[PDB]
């Protein structure tokens, strides 16, 4: 059973059928987070006091879930999409790309 880390994911807008409202780009690397949050949580997993405390509670009381591997740093990407009015606008989309993961 492998540990919480970042993984590749390329989102292709034509494959999910958004190529009709997103003029650019054609897709992007979004990545994703997945993997076990064991005990102890090692330095590179950027846990929080709470996730750490709850990983301990988990092992006495399994009815309490383990912390979860999620994105801990995200970044933006600009896109060109459609208007209600049929007009392309350009907007910077926040938190689109996973830059790092952690057990939270």
């Amino acid at each position: 059973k492998s540990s919480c880390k970042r993984h590749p994911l390329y989102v292709d807008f034509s494959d999910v059928g958004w190529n009709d409202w997103i003029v650019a780009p054609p897709g992007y690397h979004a990545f994703y987070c997945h993997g076990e949050c064991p005990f102890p949580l090692a330095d590179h997993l950027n846990s929080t006091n709470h996730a750490i405390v709850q990983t301990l509670v988990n092992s006495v009381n399994s009815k309490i879930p383990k912390a979860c591997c999620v994105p801990t740093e995200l970044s933006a990407i600009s896109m060109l999409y459609l208007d209600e009015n049929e007009k392309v606008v350009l907007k910077n989309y926040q938190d689109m790309v996973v830059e790092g993961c952690g057990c939270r």
Partner: protein, 86 residues
């Protein structure tokens, strides 16, 4: 504060470990734990300083026997070898 301590790792290595070492601002560690088939495994690595006291101190009766030990000198967790709680 910056990482300043170098530790050995095993089982809990970061993907970018260098010759199975990691760096941290907290503690080196080693842990021994027994599955439910009676067998035992050894793991080691780096623990960040924030939250380290919860982690380095040894709770009683988890769903299993485990013992974890920590230290704060360079590669010190090469010398650690915890022993299961009687």
């Amino acid at each position: 504060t910056l990482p300043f301590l170098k530790c050995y790792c095993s089982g809990h290595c970061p993907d970018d470990a260098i010759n199975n070492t990691c760096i941290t601002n907290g503690h080196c560690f080693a842990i021994i734990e027994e599955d439910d088939q009676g067998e035992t495994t050894l793991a080691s690595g780096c623990m960040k300083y924030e939250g380290s006291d919860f982690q380095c101190r040894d709770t009683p009766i988890p769903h299993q026997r485990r013992s974890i030990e920590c230290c704060r000198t360079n590669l010190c967790n090469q010398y650690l070898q915890p022993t299961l709680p009687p």
